[PDB]
Symmetry: none
């Protein structure tokens, strides 16, 4: 099983070194064992941005075909960002098997890619109508919502 | 009002030279008068495509600032197409004030632009998650849905 | 036009008598006249509740058959409350023609009824999955969201 | 052509259904989001246990109107380093030469594996690149250092 072997390697690599303020670990099953194909992680907002102070939770679901196919990465449904679907699914070219996904991509690369996305939305992939509208038409309103969401996910 | 004068012109104009199989009309108010700023229209699917035989209803909402600003065009909420948000809002650059909107654009050009979009989804507008997923990963499933939606909106 | 006669009556009535903290007015069309069948209003949260401090914006859409048929009342799409659909449509007994709508119901009655709903969600109208789930499963999380939304709509 | 586009549809299906780990290949998208069946982008992973390992080397595959009678043209980026790759990026490979081993039945998988095999095993009969061929033939240490860094350049 390449998928599970790769996920064990990812666990070992992450535990050894990962970016400051981020976390990621397999979820526990009913028996206390790890579900290597489903992880919970957290992405800190960047200092100096309206995202600062929040730690935004994601789930990473690795399909059976991983690493040939990318994991699905989701914020909570309703998370506010122009490139995040209503379901929470993150729209990012590195997570798209037809675009920039490659099997060598590490969890560290994914979580930093998502962190970078927060304060720098992509205009070729608006996935959420109200956030994209405010980001583009009413930046003051967009910024207020971002700062309130940072508070929602703050300690 | 420039807006209402233009809408009168669009109305009297549409009623003489409109694309075959399409319809468009201001909606009626409580007193049977026309709401010039809110129309109902219908877009026929092209023959030779899976959209054939349907006539897909849209509402066209003209803001007070029209024609300086574009109208908003919506299919029913839940309409299935990669470029149509959950609300029914259609993503089309000619309806975007920072891209291709120009005050001269006529309703005819708008409806034809919506028609063209049906069988050729734009990859820069990932507006509807499942429709994109199917379009990209399970084209047979995508086509089957399109075919059934054509029946939904048939005669 | 029984509808528009009733709506002109409702307007004059509102301007001479309305609860403190509330506002309501027909929207303006492109020529500066009033669209009597579409109003924008605001509902203050009541003091001593987690909704306190917010003024929550609504649209009131009166159908041609009003007052025989109730108006449709909507918060912004995405507004958080167990009885508010994703579209922002409010579920309330007095706004349902098969329930407690009566043609004699005034705008004051409607807006006070919406105000009452804010702090008392109805379990037989679970319109919003995450809001209902937090209200049932995680009161602390439910309350925090309400308090942040109050700030969002604060003065 | 018309056989050309029909064949290319089939190639896309065969590939999309089945191909070696770490390779990718897809028609490029046109301005309307539709596929250009006659120009694909692909990636060739270096073989593990060679100085090419860890790289995924990008190629373009351009199918002429007369495909599959005539072979596609396959190019690495201009300035790619390998003794059998011209300055333009064009790969010199027998199965890609109509005057040598091209046959209409050859599939994309066979092309990309042929290119992969060529990486660590240059053909002296196609010295397409002076500096690469000279280093390969006269200063192997220098050649290997360049190959290793180029693997980093295109790191998987």
């Amino acid at each position: 099983s390449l998928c599970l072997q790769r996920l064990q390697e990812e666990r070992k690599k992450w535990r050894k070194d990962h970016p400051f303020g981020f976390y990621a670990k397999p979820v526990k099953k009913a028996d206390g064992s790890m579900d290597l194909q489903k992880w919970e992680a957290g992405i800190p907002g960047k200092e100096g941005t309206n995202w600062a102070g929040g730690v935004y939770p994601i789930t990473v679901e690795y399909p059976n075909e991983y690493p040939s196919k990318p994991p699905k990465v989701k914020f909570p449904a309703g998370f506010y960002h122009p490139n995040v679907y209503p379901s929470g699914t993150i729209c990012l070219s590195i997570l798209n098997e037809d675009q920039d996904w490659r099997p060598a991509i590490t969890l560290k690369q994914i979580v930093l890619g998502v962190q970078d996305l927060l304060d720098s939305p992509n205009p070729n992939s608006p996935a959420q109508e109200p956030a994209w509208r405010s980001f583009s038409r009413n930046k003051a309103e967009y910024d207020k919502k971002v700062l309130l969401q940072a508070k929602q996910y703050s300690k």
